[PDB]
Short mmCIF file of C-alpha atoms and ligand atoms in Angstrom, two decimals:
data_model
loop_
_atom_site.label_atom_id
_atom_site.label_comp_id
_atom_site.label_asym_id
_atom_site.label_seq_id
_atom_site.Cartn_x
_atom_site.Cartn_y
_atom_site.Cartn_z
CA UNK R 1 23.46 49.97 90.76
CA UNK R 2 23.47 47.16 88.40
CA UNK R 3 20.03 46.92 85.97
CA UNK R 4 20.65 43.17 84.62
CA UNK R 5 22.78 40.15 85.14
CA UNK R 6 22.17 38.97 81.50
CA UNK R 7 25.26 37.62 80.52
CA UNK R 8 26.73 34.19 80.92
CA UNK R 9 30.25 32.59 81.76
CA UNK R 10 31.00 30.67 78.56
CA UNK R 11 28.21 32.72 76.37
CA UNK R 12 29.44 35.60 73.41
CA UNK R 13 22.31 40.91 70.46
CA UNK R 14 22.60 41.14 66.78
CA UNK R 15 23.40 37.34 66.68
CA UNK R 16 19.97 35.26 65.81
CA UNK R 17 18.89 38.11 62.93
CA UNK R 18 19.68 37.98 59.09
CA UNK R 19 20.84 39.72 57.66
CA UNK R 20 21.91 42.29 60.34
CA UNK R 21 20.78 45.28 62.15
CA UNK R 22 23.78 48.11 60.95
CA UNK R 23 25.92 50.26 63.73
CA UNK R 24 23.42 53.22 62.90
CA UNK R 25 20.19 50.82 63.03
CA UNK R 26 21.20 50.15 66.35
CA UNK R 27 22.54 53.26 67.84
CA UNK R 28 19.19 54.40 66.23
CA UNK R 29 17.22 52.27 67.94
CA UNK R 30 18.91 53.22 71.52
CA UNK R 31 18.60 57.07 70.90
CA UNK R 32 14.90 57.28 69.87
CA UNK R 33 13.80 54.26 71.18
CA UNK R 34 15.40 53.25 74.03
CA UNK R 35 15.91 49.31 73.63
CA UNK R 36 19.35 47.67 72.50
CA UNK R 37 18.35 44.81 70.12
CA UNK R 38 15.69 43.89 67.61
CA UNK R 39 13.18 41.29 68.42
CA UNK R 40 13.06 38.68 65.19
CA UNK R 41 9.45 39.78 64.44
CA UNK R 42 10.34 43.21 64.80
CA UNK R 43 13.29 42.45 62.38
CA UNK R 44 11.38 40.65 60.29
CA UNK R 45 8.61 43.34 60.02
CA UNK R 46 10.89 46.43 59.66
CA UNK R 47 13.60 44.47 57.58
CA UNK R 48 10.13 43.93 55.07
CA UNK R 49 9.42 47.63 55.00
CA UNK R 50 12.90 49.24 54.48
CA UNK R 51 14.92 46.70 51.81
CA UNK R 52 11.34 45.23 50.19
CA UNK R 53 8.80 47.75 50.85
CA UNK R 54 6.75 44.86 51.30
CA UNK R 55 3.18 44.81 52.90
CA UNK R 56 2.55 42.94 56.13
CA UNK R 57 -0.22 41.92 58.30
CA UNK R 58 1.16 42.22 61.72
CA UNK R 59 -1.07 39.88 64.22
CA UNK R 60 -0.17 41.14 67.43
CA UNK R 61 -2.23 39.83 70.58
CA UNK R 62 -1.30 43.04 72.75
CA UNK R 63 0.66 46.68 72.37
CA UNK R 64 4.13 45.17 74.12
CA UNK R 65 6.51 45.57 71.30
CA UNK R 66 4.01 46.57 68.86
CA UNK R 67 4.38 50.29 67.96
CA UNK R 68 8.36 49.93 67.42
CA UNK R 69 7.25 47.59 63.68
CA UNK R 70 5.60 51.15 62.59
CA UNK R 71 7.45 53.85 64.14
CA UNK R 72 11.49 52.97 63.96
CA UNK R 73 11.19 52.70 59.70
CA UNK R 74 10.38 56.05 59.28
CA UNK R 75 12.59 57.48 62.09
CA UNK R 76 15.95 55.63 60.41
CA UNK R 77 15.24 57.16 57.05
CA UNK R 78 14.32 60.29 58.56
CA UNK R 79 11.23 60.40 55.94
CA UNK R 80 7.48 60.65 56.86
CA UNK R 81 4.85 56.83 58.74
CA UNK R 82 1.64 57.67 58.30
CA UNK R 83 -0.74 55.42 61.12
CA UNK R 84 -4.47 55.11 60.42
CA UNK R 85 -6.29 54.85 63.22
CA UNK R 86 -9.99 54.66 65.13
CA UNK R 87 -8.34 54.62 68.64
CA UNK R 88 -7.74 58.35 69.24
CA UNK R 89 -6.85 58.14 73.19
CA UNK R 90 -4.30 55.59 72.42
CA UNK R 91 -2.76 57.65 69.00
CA UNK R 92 -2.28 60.69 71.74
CA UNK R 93 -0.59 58.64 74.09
CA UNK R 94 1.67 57.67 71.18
CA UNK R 95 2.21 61.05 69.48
CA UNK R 96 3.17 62.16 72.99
CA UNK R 97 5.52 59.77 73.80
CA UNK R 98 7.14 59.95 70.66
CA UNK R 99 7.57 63.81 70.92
CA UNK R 100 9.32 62.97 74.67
CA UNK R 101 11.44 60.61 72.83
CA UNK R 102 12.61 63.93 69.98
CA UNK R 103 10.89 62.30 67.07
CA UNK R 104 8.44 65.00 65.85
CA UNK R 105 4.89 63.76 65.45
CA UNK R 106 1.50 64.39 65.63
CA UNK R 107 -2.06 64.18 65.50
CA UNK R 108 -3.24 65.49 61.78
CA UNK R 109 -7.36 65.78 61.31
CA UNK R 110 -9.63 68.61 60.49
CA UNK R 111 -9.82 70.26 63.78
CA UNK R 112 -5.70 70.05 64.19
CA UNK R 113 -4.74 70.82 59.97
CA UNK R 114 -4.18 74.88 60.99
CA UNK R 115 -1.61 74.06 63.51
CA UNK R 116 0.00 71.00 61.87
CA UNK R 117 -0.53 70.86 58.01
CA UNK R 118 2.12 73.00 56.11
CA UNK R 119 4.86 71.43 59.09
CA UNK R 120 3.69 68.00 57.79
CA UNK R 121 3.91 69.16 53.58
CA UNK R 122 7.15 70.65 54.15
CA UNK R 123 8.70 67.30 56.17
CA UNK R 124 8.98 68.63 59.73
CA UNK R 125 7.46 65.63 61.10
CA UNK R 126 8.70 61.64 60.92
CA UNK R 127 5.26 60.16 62.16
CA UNK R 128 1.62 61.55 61.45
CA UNK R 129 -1.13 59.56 62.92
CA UNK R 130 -4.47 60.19 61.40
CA UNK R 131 -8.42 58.75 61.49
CA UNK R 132 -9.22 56.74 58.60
CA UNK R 133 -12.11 59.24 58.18
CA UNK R 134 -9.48 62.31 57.55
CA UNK R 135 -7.54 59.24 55.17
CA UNK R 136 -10.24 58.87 53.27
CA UNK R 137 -11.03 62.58 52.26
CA UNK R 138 -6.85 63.52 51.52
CA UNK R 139 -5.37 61.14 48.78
CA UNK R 140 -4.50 64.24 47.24
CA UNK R 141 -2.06 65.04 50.51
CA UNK R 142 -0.80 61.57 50.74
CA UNK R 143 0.31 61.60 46.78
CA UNK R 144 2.04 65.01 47.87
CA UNK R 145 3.68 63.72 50.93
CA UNK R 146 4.66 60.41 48.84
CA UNK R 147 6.06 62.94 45.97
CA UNK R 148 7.78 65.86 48.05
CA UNK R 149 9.21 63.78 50.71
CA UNK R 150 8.85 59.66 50.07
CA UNK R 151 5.86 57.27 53.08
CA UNK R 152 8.10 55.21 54.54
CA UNK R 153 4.97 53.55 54.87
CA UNK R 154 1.52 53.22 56.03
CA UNK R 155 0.31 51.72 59.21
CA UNK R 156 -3.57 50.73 59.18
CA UNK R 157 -4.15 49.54 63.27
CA UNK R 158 -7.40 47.83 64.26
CA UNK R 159 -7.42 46.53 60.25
CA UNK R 160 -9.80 43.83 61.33
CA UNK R 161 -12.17 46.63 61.47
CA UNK R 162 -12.21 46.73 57.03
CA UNK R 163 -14.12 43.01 57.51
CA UNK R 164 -17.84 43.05 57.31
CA UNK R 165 -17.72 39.52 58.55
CA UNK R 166 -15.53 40.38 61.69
CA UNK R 167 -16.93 41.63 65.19
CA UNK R 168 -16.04 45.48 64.85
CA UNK R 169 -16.91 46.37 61.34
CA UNK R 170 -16.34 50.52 60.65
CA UNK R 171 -17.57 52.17 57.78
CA UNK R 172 -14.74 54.14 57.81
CA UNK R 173 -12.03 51.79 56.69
CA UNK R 174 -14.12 50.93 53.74
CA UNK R 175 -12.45 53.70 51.82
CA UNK R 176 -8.45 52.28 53.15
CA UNK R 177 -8.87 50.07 49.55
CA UNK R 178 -7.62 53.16 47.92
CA UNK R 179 -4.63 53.32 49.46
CA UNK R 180 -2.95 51.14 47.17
CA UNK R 181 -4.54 52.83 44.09
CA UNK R 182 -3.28 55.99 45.07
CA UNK R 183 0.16 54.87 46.41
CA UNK R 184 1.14 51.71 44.48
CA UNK R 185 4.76 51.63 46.09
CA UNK R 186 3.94 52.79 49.61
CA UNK R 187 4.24 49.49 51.54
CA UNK R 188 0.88 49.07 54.21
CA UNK R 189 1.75 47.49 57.60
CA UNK R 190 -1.92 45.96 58.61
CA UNK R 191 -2.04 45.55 62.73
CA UNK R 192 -5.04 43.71 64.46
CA UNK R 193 -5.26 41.12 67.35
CA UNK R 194 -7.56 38.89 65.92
CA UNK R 195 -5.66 35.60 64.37
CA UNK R 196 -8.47 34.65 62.51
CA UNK R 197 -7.24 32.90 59.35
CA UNK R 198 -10.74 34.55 57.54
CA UNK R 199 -9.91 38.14 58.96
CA UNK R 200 -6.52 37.98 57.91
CA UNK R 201 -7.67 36.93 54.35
CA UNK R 202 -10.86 39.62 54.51
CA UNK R 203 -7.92 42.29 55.67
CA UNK R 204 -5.45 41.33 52.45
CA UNK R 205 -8.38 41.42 49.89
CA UNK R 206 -9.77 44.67 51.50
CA UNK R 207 -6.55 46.49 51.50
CA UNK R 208 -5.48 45.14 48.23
CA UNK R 209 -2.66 43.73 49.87
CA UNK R 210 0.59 42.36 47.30
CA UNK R 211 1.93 38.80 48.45
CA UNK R 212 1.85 40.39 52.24
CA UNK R 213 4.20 38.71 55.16
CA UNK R 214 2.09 37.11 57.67
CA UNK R 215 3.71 37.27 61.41
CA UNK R 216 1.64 36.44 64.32
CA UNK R 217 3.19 36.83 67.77
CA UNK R 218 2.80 37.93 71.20
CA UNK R 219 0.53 34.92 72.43
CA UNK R 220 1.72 32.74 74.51
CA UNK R 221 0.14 29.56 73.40
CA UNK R 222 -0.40 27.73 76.80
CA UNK R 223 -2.11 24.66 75.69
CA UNK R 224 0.80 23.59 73.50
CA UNK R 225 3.44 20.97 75.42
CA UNK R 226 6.85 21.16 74.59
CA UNK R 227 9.53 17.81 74.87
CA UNK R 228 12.28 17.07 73.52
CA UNK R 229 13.40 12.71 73.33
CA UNK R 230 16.43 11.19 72.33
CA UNK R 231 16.26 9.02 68.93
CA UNK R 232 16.37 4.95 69.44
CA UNK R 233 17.64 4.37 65.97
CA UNK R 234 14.67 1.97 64.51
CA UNK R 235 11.51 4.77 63.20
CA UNK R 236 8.96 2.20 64.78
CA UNK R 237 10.97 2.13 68.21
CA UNK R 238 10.51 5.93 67.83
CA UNK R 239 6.92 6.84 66.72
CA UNK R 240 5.25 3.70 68.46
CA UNK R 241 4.81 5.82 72.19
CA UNK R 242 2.36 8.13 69.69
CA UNK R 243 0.30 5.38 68.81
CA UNK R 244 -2.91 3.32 69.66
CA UNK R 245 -4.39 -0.02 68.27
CA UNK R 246 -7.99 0.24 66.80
CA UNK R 247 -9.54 -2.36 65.05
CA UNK R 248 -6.64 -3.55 62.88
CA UNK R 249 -5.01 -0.45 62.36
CA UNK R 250 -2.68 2.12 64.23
CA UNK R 251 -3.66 5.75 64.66
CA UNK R 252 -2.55 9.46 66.21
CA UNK R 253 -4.77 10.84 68.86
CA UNK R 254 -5.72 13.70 66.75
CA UNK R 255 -4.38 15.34 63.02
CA UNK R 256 -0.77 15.08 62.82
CA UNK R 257 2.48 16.71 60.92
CA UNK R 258 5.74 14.83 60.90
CA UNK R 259 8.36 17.02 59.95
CA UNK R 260 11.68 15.75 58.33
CA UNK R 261 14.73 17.43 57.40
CA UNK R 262 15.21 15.26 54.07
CA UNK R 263 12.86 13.79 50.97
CA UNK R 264 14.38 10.37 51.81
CA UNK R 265 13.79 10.27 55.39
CA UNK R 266 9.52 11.66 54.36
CA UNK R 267 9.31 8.41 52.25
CA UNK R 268 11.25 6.26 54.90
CA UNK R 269 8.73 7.25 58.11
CA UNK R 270 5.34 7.38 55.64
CA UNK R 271 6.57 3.56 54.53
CA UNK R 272 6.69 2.54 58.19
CA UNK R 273 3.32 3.80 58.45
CA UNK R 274 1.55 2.42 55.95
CA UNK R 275 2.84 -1.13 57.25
CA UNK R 276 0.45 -0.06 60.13
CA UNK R 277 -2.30 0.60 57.72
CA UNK R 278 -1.79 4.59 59.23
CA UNK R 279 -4.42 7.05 56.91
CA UNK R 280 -1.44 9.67 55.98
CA UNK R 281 0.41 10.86 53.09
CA UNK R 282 4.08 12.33 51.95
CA UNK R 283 4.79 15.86 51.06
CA UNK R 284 7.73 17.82 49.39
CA UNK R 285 9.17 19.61 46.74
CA UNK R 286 9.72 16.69 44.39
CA UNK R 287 5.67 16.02 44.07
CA UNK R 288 3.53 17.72 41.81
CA UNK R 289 1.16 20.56 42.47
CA UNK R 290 -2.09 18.03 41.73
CA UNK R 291 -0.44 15.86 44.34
CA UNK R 292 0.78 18.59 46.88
CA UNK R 293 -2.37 20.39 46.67
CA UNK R 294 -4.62 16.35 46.98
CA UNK R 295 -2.91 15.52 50.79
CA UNK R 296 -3.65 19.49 51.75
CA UNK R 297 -7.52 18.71 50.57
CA UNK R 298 -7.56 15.20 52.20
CA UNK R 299 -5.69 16.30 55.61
CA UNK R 300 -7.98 19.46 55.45
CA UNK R 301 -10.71 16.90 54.95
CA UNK R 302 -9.76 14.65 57.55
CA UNK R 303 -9.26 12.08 54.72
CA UNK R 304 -5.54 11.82 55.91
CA UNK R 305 -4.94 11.79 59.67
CA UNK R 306 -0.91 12.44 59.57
CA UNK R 307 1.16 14.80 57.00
CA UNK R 308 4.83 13.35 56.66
CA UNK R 309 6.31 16.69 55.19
CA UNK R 310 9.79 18.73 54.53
CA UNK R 311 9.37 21.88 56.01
CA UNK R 312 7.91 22.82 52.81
CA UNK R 313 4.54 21.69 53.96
CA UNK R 314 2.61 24.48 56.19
CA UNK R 315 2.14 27.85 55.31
CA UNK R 316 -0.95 27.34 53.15
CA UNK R 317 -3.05 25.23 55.65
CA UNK R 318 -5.45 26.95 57.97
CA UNK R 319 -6.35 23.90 60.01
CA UNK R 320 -7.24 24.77 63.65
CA UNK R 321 -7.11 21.09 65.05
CA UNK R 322 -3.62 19.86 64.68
CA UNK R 323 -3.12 17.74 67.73
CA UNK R 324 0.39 16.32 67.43
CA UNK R 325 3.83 18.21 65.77
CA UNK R 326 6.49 15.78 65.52
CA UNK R 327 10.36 17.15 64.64
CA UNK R 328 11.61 13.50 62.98
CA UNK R 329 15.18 14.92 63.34
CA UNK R 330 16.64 18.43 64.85
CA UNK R 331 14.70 21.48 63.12
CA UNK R 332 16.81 23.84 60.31
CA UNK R 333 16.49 26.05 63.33
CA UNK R 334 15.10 27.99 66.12
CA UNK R 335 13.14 30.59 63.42
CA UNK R 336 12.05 27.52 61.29
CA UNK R 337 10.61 25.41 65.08
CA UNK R 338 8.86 28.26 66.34
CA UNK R 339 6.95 28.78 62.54
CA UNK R 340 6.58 24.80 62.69
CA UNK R 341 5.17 24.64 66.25
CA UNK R 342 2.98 27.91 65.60
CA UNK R 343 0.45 25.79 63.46
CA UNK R 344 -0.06 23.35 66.14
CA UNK R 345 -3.59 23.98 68.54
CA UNK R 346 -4.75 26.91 66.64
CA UNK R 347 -8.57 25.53 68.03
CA UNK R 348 -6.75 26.35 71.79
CA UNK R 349 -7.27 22.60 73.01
CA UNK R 350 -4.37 20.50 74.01
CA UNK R 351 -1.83 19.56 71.45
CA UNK R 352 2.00 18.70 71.59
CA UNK R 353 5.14 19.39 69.93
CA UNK R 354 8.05 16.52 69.93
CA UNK R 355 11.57 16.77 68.51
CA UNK R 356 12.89 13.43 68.08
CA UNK R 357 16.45 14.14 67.77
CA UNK R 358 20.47 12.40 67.92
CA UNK R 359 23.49 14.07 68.20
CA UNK R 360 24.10 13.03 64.94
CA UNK R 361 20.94 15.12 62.92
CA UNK R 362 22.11 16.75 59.53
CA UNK R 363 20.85 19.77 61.41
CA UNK R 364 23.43 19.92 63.76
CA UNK R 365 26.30 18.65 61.19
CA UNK R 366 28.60 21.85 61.12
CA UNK R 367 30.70 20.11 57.74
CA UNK R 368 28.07 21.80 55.82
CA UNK R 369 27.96 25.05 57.35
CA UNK R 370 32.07 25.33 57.12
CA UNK R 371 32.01 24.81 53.14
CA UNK R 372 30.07 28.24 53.32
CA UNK R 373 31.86 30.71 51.64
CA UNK R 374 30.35 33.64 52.52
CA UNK R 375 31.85 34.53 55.98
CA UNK R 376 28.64 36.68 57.66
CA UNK R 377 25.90 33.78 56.23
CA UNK R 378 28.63 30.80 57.47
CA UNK R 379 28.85 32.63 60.75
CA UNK R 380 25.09 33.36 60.76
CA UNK R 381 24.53 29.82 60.40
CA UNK R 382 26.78 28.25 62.82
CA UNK R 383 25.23 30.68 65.55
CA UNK R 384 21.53 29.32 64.67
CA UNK R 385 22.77 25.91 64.91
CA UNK R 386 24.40 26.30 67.80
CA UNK R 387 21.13 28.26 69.69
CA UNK R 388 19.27 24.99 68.21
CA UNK R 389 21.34 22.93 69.84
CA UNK R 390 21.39 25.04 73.42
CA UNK R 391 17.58 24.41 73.06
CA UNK R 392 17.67 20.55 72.74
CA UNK R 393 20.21 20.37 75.04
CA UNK R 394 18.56 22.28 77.87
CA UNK R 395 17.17 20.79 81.20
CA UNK R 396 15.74 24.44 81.84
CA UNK R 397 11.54 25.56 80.48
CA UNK R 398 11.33 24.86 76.54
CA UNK R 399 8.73 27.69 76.86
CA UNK R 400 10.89 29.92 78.92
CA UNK R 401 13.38 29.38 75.89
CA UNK R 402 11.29 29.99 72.92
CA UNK R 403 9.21 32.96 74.78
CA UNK R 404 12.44 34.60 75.77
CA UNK R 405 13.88 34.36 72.43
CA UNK R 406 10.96 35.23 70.03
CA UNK R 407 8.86 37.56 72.59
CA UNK R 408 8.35 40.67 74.36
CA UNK R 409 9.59 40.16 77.82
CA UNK R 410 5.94 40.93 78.84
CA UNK R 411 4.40 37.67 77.12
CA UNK R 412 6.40 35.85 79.67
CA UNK R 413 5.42 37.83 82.46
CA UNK R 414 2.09 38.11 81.73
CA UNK R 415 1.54 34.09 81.14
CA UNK R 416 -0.39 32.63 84.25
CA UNK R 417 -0.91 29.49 84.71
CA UNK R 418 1.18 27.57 82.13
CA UNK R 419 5.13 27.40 83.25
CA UNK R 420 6.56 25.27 86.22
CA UNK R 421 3.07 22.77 85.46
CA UNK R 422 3.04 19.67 84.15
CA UNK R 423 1.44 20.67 80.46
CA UNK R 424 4.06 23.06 80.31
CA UNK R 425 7.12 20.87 78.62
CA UNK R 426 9.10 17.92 80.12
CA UNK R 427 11.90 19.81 81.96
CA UNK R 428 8.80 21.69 83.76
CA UNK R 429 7.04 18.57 84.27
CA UNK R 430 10.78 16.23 85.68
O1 LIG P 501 2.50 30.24 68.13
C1 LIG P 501 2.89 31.37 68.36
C2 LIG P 501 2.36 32.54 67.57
N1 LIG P 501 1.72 32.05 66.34
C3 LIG P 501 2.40 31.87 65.15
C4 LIG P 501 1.74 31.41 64.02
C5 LIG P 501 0.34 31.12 64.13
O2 LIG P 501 -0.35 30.68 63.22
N2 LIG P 501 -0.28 31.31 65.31
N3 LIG P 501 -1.60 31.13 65.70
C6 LIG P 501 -1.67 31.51 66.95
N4 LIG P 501 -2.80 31.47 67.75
C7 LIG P 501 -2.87 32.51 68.79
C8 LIG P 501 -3.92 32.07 69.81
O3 LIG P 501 -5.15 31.78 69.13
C9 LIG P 501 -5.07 30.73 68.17
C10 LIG P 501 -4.06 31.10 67.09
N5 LIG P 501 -0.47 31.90 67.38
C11 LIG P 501 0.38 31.80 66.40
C12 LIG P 501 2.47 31.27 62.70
C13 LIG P 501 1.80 32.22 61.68
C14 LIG P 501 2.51 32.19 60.32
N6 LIG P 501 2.61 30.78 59.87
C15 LIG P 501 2.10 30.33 58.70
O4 LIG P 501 2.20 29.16 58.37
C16 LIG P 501 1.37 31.22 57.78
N7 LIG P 501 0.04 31.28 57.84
C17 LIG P 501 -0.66 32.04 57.03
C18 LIG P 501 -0.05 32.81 56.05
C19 LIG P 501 1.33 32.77 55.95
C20 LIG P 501 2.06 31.96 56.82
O5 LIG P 501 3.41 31.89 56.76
C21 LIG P 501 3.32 29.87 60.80
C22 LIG P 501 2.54 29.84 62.12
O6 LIG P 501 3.78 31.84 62.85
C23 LIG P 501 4.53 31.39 63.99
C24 LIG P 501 3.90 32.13 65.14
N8 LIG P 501 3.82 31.65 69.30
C25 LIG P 501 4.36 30.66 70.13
C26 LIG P 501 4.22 30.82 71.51
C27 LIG P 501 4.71 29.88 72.41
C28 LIG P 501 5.37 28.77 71.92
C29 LIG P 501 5.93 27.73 72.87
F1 LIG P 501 6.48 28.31 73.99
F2 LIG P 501 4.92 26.88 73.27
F3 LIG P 501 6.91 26.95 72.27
C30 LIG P 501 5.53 28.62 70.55
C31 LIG P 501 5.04 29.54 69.66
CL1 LIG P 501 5.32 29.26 67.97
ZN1 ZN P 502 8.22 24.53 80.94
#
């Protein structure tokens, strides 16, 4: 009988992911793993690993998708993942299902080195999951296993376990800082659930983490609202529904971002603004650092109420209250919106997330995309824009969208509470 109904009259895996997954990535992933396309974050992980040997810290609320960012990089180059561990129940379940799958792995500690140990030196096995106890007491193996047959690279799970100041401190990982003396080219994939900005920060230092990429994904963020609204063609017209009078000045409910795709277009909304005596400030690439790094301390501070920003602005601020996202103009794209809209409500109260958008947005201008000359990146390109434009378009769940796209299938079907309500987004709420 038929499994799915996925496909669409009108509608042409691989698509949304840069660069791509290779015929042997995928047929790869189908033999061993059982799945037929890449999740971005998954991409975006394993992409890290294999090309940059980059570290990451991984902030994954559950196991749905998880053990895939880990286990497929050393399975494609048919080398040797090491995963640290405390969790011994769940690293059994693992190794078994992994062995049911044909990729040989196991379970290496004192107790288990007669069976396993010479297998492991001489490369019989493509994932060896380990306490960080054992870890700590074998750098020697590890610089052999590194030297004779090349880590892929290192997975430390539960990392938020290194931080003193966390909730579920071990002694054990204490020792995990040597990984990176030891193995200075062995990339370490970090994996915890907390998305504590001082964890994550506590995890980097402890692990002696190099410039690591920060993901954080399957939550499923239910007290953000999601609408999309038709430009008017006047900026006051526009922003003035966001608004309320005090005093002799006009405010935001709460700490706001207003992203724009142009420089121009920063100045031309922060000028509008400022006729309303609004506390806020510009940011982009053409400031200085003094000044770029001044409206971060102020907005921080709550000095500034409302960030008018390229889509340079963001990655270095922490701030847990952000009430309000405003798109001033379509997004880049669906990647750049869902990394845009993920800084919004980090505190878990109620914020929103507006694109003000017109047909007409340089963001959905495909003149610019057909002067690329490079025929995978032009066609790359045309298919984000058009999966942009899908999205503003759509009179079906924003959430639905974005979840469906970004997330495990299970972050959808494990949300109650949130879709089909009226704080959901405005197609839910029509
Ligand atoms: O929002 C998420 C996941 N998420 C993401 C982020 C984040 O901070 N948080 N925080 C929480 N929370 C989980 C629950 O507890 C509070 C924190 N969840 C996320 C960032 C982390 C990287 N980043 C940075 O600037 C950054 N930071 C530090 C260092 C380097 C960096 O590059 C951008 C924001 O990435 C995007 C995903 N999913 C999500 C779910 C539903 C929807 C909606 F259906 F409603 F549309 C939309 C989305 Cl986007
Ligand atoms: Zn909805």
């Amino acid at each position: 009988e038929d499994d799915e109904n996925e496909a669409n009259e009108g509608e042409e895996d691989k698509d949304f992911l840069w660069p791509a997954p290779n015929e042997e990535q995928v047929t790869c992933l189908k033999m061993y793993f059982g799945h037929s396309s890449f999740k971005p974050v998954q991409w975006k992980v394993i992409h890290s690993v294999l090309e940059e040997r980059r570290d990451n810290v991984a902030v994954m609320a559950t196991g749905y998708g998880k053990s895939l960012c880990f286990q497929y990089p050393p399975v494609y180059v048919g080398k040797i993942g090491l995963v640290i561990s405390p969790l011994i129940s769940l690293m059994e379940d693992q190794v078994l299902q992994l062995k049911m799958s044909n990729i040989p792995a196991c379970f290496l500690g004192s107790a288990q080195s007669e069976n396993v140990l010479t297998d492991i030196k001489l490369g019989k096995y493509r994932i060896v999951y380990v306490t960080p106890e054992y870890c700590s007491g074998n750098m020697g193996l590890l610089q052999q296993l590194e030297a004779d047959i090349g880590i892929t690279l290192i997975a430390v799970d539960e990392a938020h376990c290194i931080s003193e100041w966390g909730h579920d401190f071990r002694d054990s990982f204490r020792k995990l800082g040597s990984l990176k003396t030891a193995l200075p080219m062995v990339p370490i994939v970090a994996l915890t659930a907390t998305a504590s900005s001082s964890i994550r920060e506590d995890i980097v230092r402890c692990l002696n983490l190099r410039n690591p990429q920060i993901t954080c994904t399957g939550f499923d963020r239910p007290n953000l609202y999601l609408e999309v609204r038709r430009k008017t063609g006047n900026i006051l017209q526009d922003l003035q529904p966001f608004l309320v009078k005090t005093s002799s000045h006009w405010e935001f409910e709460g700490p706001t971002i207003i992203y724009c795709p142009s420089r121009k277009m920063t100045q031309q909304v922060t000028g509008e603004l400022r006729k309303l005596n609004l506390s806020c400030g510009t940011y982009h690439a053409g400031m200085s650092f003094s000044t770029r790094k001044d409206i971060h301390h102020r907005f921080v501070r709550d000095e500034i109420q409302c960030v008018i920003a390229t889509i340079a602005f963001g990655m270095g601020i922490n701030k847990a209250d952000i009430r309000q996202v405003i798109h001033y103009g379509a997004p880049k794209d669906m990647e750049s919106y869902y990394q845009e809209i993920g800084r919004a409500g980090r505190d878990g109260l109620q914020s929103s997330c507006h694109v003000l958008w017109a047909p007409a947005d340089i963001n959905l201008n495909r003149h610019l995309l057909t002067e690329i000359r490079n025929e995978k990146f032009r066609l790359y390109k045309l298919k984000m824009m058009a999966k942009m434009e899908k999205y503003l378009h759509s009179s079906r769940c924003r959430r639905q969208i974005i979840l469906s796209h970004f997330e495990d299938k299970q972050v959808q079907k494990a949300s109650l509470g949130i879709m089909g309500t009226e704080k959901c987004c405005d197609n839910c709420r029509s």
